[PDB]
Design a protein around this nucleic acid. Sequence first.
RNA 1: GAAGACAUUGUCAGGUGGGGAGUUUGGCUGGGGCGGCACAUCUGUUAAACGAUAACGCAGAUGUCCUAAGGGGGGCUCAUGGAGAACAGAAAUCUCCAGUAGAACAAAAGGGUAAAAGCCCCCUUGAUUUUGAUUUUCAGUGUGAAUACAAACCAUGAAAGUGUGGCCUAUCGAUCCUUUAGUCCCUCGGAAUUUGAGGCUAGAGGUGCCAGAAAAGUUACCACAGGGAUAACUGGCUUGUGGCAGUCAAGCGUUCAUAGCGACAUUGCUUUUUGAUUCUUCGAUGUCGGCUCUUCCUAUCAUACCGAAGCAGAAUUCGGUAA
RNA 2: UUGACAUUGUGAAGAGACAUAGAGGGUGUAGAAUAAGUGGGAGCUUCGGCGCCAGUGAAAUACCACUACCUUUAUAGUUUC
RNA 3: GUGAUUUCUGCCCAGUGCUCUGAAUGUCAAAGUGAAGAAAUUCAACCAAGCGCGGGUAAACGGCGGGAGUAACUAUGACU
RNA 4: AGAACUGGCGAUGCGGGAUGAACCGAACGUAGAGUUAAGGUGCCGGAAUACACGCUCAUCAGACACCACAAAAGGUGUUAG
RNA 5: GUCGAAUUUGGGUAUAGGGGCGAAAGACUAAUCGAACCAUCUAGUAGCUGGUUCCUGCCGAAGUUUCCCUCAGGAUAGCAGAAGCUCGUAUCAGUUUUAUGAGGUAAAGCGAAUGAUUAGAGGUUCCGGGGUCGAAAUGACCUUGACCUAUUCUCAAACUUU
Lengths: 234, 94, 44, 50
Amino acid sequence: ATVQIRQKVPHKRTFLFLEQLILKHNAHVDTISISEAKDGLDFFYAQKNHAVKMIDFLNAVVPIKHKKSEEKFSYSVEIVPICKDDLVVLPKKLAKSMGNISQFVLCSKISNTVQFMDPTTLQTADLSPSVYWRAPFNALADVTQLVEFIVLDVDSTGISRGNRVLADITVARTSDLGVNDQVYYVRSHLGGICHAGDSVMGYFIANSNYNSDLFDGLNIDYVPDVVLVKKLYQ
Amino acid sequence: VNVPKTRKTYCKGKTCRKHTQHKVTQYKAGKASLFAQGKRRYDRKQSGFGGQTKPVFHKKAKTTKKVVLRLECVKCKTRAQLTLKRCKHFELGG
Amino acid sequence: NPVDHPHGGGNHQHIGKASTISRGAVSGQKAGLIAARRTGLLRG
Amino acid sequence: GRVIRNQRKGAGSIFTSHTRLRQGAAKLRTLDYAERHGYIRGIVKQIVHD
RNA sequence: GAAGACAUUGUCAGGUGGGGAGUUUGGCUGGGGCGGCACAUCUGUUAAACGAUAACGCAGAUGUCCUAAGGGGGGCUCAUGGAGAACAGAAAUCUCCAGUAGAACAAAAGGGUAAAAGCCCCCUUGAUUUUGAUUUUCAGUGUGAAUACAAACCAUGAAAGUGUGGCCUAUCGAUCCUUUAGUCCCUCGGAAUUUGAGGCUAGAGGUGCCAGAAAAGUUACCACAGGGAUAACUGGCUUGUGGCAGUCAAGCGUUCAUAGCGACAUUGCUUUUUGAUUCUUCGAUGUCGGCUCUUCCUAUCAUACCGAAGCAGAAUUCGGUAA
RNA sequence: UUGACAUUGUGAAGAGACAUAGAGGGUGUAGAAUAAGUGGGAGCUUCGGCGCCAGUGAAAUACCACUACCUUUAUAGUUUC
RNA sequence: GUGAUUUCUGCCCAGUGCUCUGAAUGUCAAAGUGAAGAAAUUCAACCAAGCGCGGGUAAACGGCGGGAGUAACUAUGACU
RNA sequence: AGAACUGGCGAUGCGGGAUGAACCGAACGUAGAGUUAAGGUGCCGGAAUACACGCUCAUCAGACACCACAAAAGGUGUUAG
RNA sequence: GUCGAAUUUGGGUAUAGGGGCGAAAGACUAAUCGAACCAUCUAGUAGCUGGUUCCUGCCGAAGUUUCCCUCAGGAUAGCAGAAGCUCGUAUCAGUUUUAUGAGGUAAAGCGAAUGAUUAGAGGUUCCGGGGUCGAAAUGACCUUGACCUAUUCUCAAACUUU
Ligand SMILES: [Zn+2]
């Protein structure tokens, strides 16, 4: 029996988490061998129902789709190409079916259903694996597409979710503050952790040059110039 | 792939005829006007009971497209065209 | 046989498709149940 | 394809009603002054089978 | 009497509409179907010492990847093994010697390469403009890819010099139509202006059945032209498998290779099996079995005469002439 | 089958939408402080109201291309129902 | 559709069809309306049915398979 | 079944292989004399029942390549070595 | 088989071709039915079968390349005939020689590379395993594995100096 998992993403973050969760849930205690693959990993077993157990362990945590090949019980799985700190975007029929979230979204955390979050207003949209792999996309970005910011002041606008504030902040670039004073009017959602001198990493939209098929529907006067993501150390 | 948004390249302009800095962009098709002769013809041939009259293409087998660069010369704002190879990816180095 | 009826034909006596026809269905289709809000025995 | 017997049942020619032995058409008498204002009397001469 | 400027009728528009109409429903193919691509292409071998050269021949590969993994220059030398250094171990880092490539050069395979074509760094956009000549495939048509010059402009370098994409060999696309770049050119044909449209030169969107139709099935109700270029039967070549027999003889055989049998190997015969093949027959050779009837063959079940046995008799087996 | 035009004339009530002006509209635990906001913001500018930090602060207010939110009524019609 | 009588006619509305007195703006032709324009035209809003959402329906087409866990052990045409 | 070089049959008769699309010889106007090819000379059958050294006797001898088949293993049958 | 009934039957009458009628077999519809009969369009088209008429003479093939929804077919080059044209032994030839080049097949070789392979013998280890001696060893000796050396047997369409 051979149960194999796959990623199509320029990097790996959900699997750098999977390695952590396997070591605390302990389902590899019976695997004959664990082989790194072109993008993921394969687990070897000698029985069938324990392979049925490992595929259900795989199903237990992350949204997936799972099928069965043969030669010896080959069970393949493809994984959602969505990571914690991504510029993700929901297609038209998917955002009406799921959540009525605006065209721009963020996936703050990963769970059994992939959750989405819009930078402008505060709402969570949980999504099962079926409809996504019925309508596959690749997100517009990953976690390796970031740059650093430097604030002067913070100003929480007072309303707040359990973990969000929709705070308006005045962000300022590091090397630019010293040539120009480019400070924008951008609303932030995680603005409850930022302080009078610390650094946040953010997705610069106002110069980035992307490629995908979902940009031909929206308008160009509603795009935020900047959209931020979680903190590193401060 | 990656292509910087700028490059130094020959300009056929009446005044330059030299290598002058160019801003590159991707080539996007137009709008397919309704008053093009080969659309005023289609719209008439189709007009009636005959049915469909011209072919429609089904048997697509490609998976990419060639990429095409529109190169504007900064000091005479004239333009030029280049093509490249088939690519499943294309971004600029802005 | 199928020339004679929509239900016709078959190497078993089967209708093949539903008997609940529509209401705008035309002459030659309207063979069976016509605007059936319901079928079947309720409990008897 | 052929036309079904239901599509053939609309021109007639064998599917007409067999009206030979019919006593007649069953119809109330006309609305006239006597039935509107007041009444009129009649009498059954026979009960008969149609 | 009722209904009433609604219905009805007329015309346009959208939906529904195998009830109906017209059509189509690839090719190669050891028959045809499924399968697969030998259908456009690449490397080595088939391929038989120039070149060309076939099969559903072999081992494999492509429909991508690259702003550097292109271009130029300067420094340097690899895989590996040996000797050594605290934690440090077969393996981190550091040092020396050997080291003709056994490394690397995006990707298959083959070639090619050492003050480099590889490893590190510096500057960069010759991956540019104009159009021509040539080589390969080849009709000496295209397409694709490449080669060597010219005229201009550029980069690099001290300079020679090199550079017109990837070290070489594969990595891709006509007419029509649409769209963009350009002279700011031509035309809109009674004369003018402005929109709009059409034209010229170079690109892109694509046909992978890859010199490029717009296309689902069934017929056991069936049809037509024709085909033995082609299957299903006999016959014929072949005889793998099947069937039969032989030669060595390791051993079984209470001892005793061979009375009888006999493995590991090995030589053949047969066309009463099945198969392969496709010559004949598709303007027809009446196609399972049984009944009936005749004849032939011997590889003899019996009967006749004989031999040999682990043949006392009896009964059995082996063999012979013999059908 | 559905819609529009015509056939198709005569009327009444209305309900909202359009085109104009008007202002509420605005508002934290806290401050001269009604504010999603905001720039050409050392100034537009009088008492000095102010003044990005004046002070508090969620806003930066003062001038300004500025919806900075209008729930609204009144218009002379167009009338979509 | 089924095919005397007698005895029975089980669980399934996810799918495909049929249906609906159901919420309604997502889609949505022609006309009409508004805006730019010299105009041909272009752009937008509104927008019927139908589609889509929700519900019903099997004597309507039709379908009615798997895996586990219940202590020594035993995993039940039982239960989870 | 499928390729390479050449020669042929096809499209080609003639003498020979009894006969045979392809082999050997040889390529064709009508005729006569002579000479040969390949093959053959017991008779059918035109031509030596010729000469010479030997081998073989088979109760399924053997006898013109292509060609129309025949092996492994054996024999004191015989011959020579 | 049925024979007093869903019976049999004459005559009259209705239904007419993508239409009728059908106790339904795709059955019947004037010896005609998975769509009648008549005439016309119609000399329907056919890359497919068959046939294609007098003599002699001269020359005389092809079944191969490239493309084609191309594989019983066409176009294309070739083969072949005819008409000849300009010239008159050139400078041509399915040929040899002399000179000078290219090739990587046959053979050969692997005590030469890459791979494949039988054998033992000489060594090496602080270092792969075991065994005796052992408190241990960077201790000793047996021993099998490895590699190292010098030989040895046999091979390569996709190995090669030659
Ligand atoms: Zn210029």
